[PDB]
Every structure is written in structure tokens, then in C-alpha cells.
């Protein structure tokens, strides 16, 4: 779709692998924010998204947390705490026909800025200056959308660049989007390095005598410390007691 009418794709209840995309050697830019390009197949997320739009080469840098300009303030804005990975690559082979492809638009004029993760497909006449346009197009009244004009015979900064923006999100809710991790056996009564759905650490996983509510999965203590969790596979309550330590 266009930049001002990007399509948001919700991903949930599945296992997502990301190593096959980073090692594909086809994506030009694979910048990750908040996370790393590696060590992501061992984490589980709760709700991720996947945006898709086509911009030009000189505007790929504007799709980043903190960057500002024209395509990052009126069409698609990313938050400053965006925890995801921006994926873009050159596509000057099917999105640029002879003569000029005018199927991609970008919002050029807008009254105010754009809040992060917001879509606006309005096509009202931008009222510039002081004379009310009242719907007509003329002096001080410009159209909000403008065509790109993708021609195959252009520079590196005027070619189509399909951008995919993955918006990861990790919460305390039951995570669904996991990674390719081999589930091991639950070992108890010993201080071992456990690896849950995103709550890592070392401790003695024992049996607890508390009552977890059907909607509750994790647990915490009076000092904001996780002392009990719920098994992903089974429905048992495993109390996380700290490992043995002290002074000498």
C-alpha cells in the first residue's frame, strides 16, 4: 500500500523465526531498536505487528525512533521507545514501470504532526495562508497527497524501497509469539539457570503452596521480585527461591 495508508498486520498464536531473514543477504537495512539482530530466536513476545509501505531511498533513514522530516512526521511516525527492527530493501525491479509508476502516494501537507502509530487517509484540501479554501483547489490551497513517480532510470535515492516495520512488545500477559527454542525437562530441587518465556535467571525451582488465579501467570513479592511462576507446558506452580549464597 501507500505510505499514508500502510497496512498493519497482527501476528499472534504462532512461532516466529527471525534468523532466516537476517541471514537472507537480500535485505539492505536490518537495523534493530531495543533488541539485537541476534539472540532473538530465544525470546518470546506477546503481541507483535508488521507494517508494510514503499518509500524512496533518501527517506529510509527517516524511519527510525527520533528521526524527523516529511515522511516521518506526516505519513508514518515511530515512537521514541520503539522496540523493534526496521527491515528495508531495494525493489527497483517490479515497483517502477516505464514512464513512471504513480500508484504510491505520500502526504505532503498537514496541519499538525502525527502521533506514533497513527493512520490518516483523509484527503481534505490543505488550507494554507488565511483564505478559506472551502473545498476548492487554487492559490494557497494545495492537495495533501503527492505522487512519487518511480522511474527505473534514477539514482539510488529515487528508487522504491519496501520497508517492513516489526513492532515487538513484551508484557506480563501469556506470550504467544515465541522463538525456535527446544523445550527441555523441568528440573527441580536444584539451583539451575532456568529459561522461561522471557523471565530468565538462576534459582531453586521448588513446589509452591500458593493459589494462582486462572488468569495470572507470573508472580511477584513485596520487594518487586519474581518468586513464583507458572509452567508453560503444565499448569504447576513453581516457586523461584534464590540460589544459595552468603559471605565468607
Amino acid at each position, epitope marked *: 500500500a501507500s505510505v499514508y495508508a500502510w497496512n498493519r498486520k497482527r501476528i499472534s498464536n504462532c512461532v516466529a523465526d527471525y534468523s532466516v531473514l537476517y541471514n537472507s543477504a537480500s535485505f539492505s537495512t536490518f537495523k534493530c531498536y531495543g533488541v539485537s539482530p541476534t539472540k532473538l530466536n530465544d525470546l518470546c513476545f506477546t503481541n507483535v505487528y508488521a507494517d508494510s509501505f514503499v518509500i524512496r531511498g533518501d527517506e529510509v533513514r527517516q524511519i527510525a525512533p527520533g528521526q524527523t522530516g516529511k515522511i516521518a512526521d506526516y505519513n508514518y511516525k515511530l515512537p521514541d521507545d520503539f522496540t523493534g527492527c526496521v527491515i528495508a530493501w531495494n525493489s527497483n525491479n517490479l515497483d517502477s514501470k516505464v*514512464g513512471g509508476n*504513480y500508484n504510491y502516494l505520500y502526504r505532503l501537507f498537514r496541519k499538525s504532526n502525527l502521533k506514533p502509530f497513527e493512520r490518516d487517509i483523509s484527503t481534505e484540501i490543505y488550507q494554507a495562508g488565511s483564505t478559506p479554501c*472551502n*473545498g*476548492v*483547489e*487554487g492559490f494557497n490551497c494545495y*492537495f495533501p*497527497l503527492q505522487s512519487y513517480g518511480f522511474q527505473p532510470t534514477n539514482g539510488v535515492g529515487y528508487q522504491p524501497y519496501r520497508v517492513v516495520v516489526l513492532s515487538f512488545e513484551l508484557l506480563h500477559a501469556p506470550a504467544t509469539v515465541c522463538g525456535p527454542k527446544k523445550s527441555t525437562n523441568l528440573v527441580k530441587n536444584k539451583c539451575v539457570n532456568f529459561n522461561f518465556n522471557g523471565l530468565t535467571g538462576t534459582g531453586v525451582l521448588t513446589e509452591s503452596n500458593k493459589k494462582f488465579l486462572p488468569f495470572q501467570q507470573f508472580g511477584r513479592d513485596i520487594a518487586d521480585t519474581t518468586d513464583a511462576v507458572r509452567d508453560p507446558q503444565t499448569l504447576e506452580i513453581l516457586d523461584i527461591t534464590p540460589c544459595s549464597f552468603g559471605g565468607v
Partner: antibody, heavy 120, light 109 residues
Framework: QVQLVQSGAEVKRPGSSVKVSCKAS????????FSWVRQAPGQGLEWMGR????????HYAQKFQGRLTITADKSTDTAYMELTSLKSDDTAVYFC?????????????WGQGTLVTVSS | EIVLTQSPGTLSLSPGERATLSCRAS???????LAWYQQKRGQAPRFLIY???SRATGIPDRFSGSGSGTDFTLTISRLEPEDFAVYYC?????????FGQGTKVEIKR
């Protein structure tokens, strides 16, 4: 500068469809919309519809929703107007107009007109 | 708003005298959205004035129009022999564009 060349007269048969073109020139085809207005003999003008090339949106009139299909090729700069299920009282001079890309517009640039006679 | 009726209809006037063409609307046009045209014999209409107040590109100052809410008037001062055609009205303040009837100015002999 801006010349909207149209086609010629079309001697069509009753109960059929026609296709009149409008060769646009002068400026860019995407920065200006196009509307077609017919003129019955001695009966004023009549706005049929309008298309937006940049948005590919074509909103017709209440009396043409279903029989009027206006297209526009953004490669050859030509606006097409097709009318299906033509009646006998359709011997109007169809004019081409290069309207703006707003909700309200005026038919400043005109063409030459095509006297398409349906009843033959 | 969707209705335009020409009051004169016909006007037998001599070249040189002022002309007055009216266009009555059913409802009121909010932002004086009215346009005037000039269609000669076997030709396309010519855009004359936008907004009923100012000429568009090169129309001389002889063609002038007044601004009102429900009834506009066109003043063709110093009428020339070449300015003998049919003039139409067009209200672009509503969603469906509507036209008028047409006033033909002929030579008075």
C-alpha cells in the same frame, strides 16, 4: 498550452455502448482531475461524472450510477468515458473538462465536443 | 443550490450598451460559488469569472459580476460585436454540479 483533444463523431447503434477519449496535454495528468459534461441540443449542460487520476476514484451522478464508467490511463494521458445501455435520447455533445482535484471545482479548461448519435 | 434559472432568456441589444444577465438559485450559495461561461456557435464554453467576482486568466474588465447570497448578476459593460454567444451559469457550492439555461445575445437592428 493545455489542449484537451477529443475523438470524432461516433455513428453507433441503438442499445449499445460507446467509448469517447480525451487526449490531455500541456501539464501533468496526475495533478488535475477530469470531468465529462454532456450537452443536449438546446437543453443546456449536464454534469455526468468526474474521476481523480491520482486517487483512482470516480464518483458519478445519481442518475448515472450503474451506466457511467469513466476511466483514465495515467500512461498515455487519455481520459475515457463509456456509457452502457444507451437510450434514444443520448444525442448530446460530450465535452471533456480538466477540473481540479478538490470537492468543489469549476470547468475552466474545455475541449471540442463529440456529437455521438445513438439512434441511427 | 441545485436549481439555476436564467431570468432574461433572450436579449436583443445593440453593440455598445451594457448587459445584465441574472441567475436565480433555489437555496443560498454559501461562499458565492458561482461561475459564468460563454459558448459560441459550434464551440466549447469559455470560462469567464470564478467566484462571480474576479476573472480567471485574461478575461477583460468589461465582464463583471456582483456577489450575493441567492441571486447573482453579470454586467457585460461596453458590449462588443464579438461577444454575442450563449452564457451559462454554474454553481460549485454543492456536491452535484448544476448548470443553467442560457441567454443568447443577438444583434439589434
Amino acid at each position: 498550452q493545455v489542449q484537451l483533444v477529443q475523438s470524432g463523431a461516433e455513428v453507433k447503434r441503438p442499445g449499445s455502448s460507446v467509448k469517447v477519449s480525451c487526449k490531455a496535454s500541456g501539464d501533468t495528468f496526475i495533478n488535475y482531475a477530469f470531468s465529462w459534461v454532456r450537452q443536449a441540443p438546446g437543453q443546456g449542460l449536464e454534469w455526468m461524472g468526474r474521476i481523480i487520476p491520482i486517487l483512482d476514484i470516480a464518483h458519478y451522478a445519481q442518475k448515472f450510477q450503474g451506466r457511467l464508467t469513466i476511466t483514465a490511463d495515467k500512461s498515455t494521458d487519455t481520459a475515457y468515458m463509456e456509457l452502457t445501455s444507451l437510450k434514444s435520447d443520448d444525442t448530446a455533445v460530450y465535452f471533456c473538462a480538466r477540473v481540479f482535484r478538490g470537492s468543489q471545482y469549476w470547468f475552466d479548461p474545455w475541449g471540442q465536443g463529440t456529437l455521438v448519435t445513438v439512434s441511427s | 443550490e441545485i436549481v439555476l434559472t436564467q431570468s432574461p432568456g433572450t436579449l436583443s441589444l445593440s453593440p455598445g450598451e451594457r448587459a445584465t444577465l441574472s441567475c436565480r438559485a433555489s437555496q443560498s450559495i454559501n461562499n458565492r460559488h458561482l461561475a459564468w461561461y460563454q459558448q459560441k456557435r459550434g464551440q466549447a464554453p469559455r470560462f469567464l469569472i470564478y467566484g462571480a467576482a474576479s476573472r480567471a486568466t485574461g478575461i477583460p474588465d468589461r465582464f463583471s459580476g456582483s456577489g450575493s447570497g441567492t441571486d447573482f448578476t453579470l454586467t457585460i459593460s461596453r458590449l462588443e460585436p464579438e461577444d454575442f454567444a450563449v452564457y451559462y451559469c454554474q454553481q460549485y457550492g454543492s456536491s452535484p454540479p448544476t448548470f443553467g439555461q442560457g441567454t443568447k445575445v443577438e444583434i439589434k437592428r
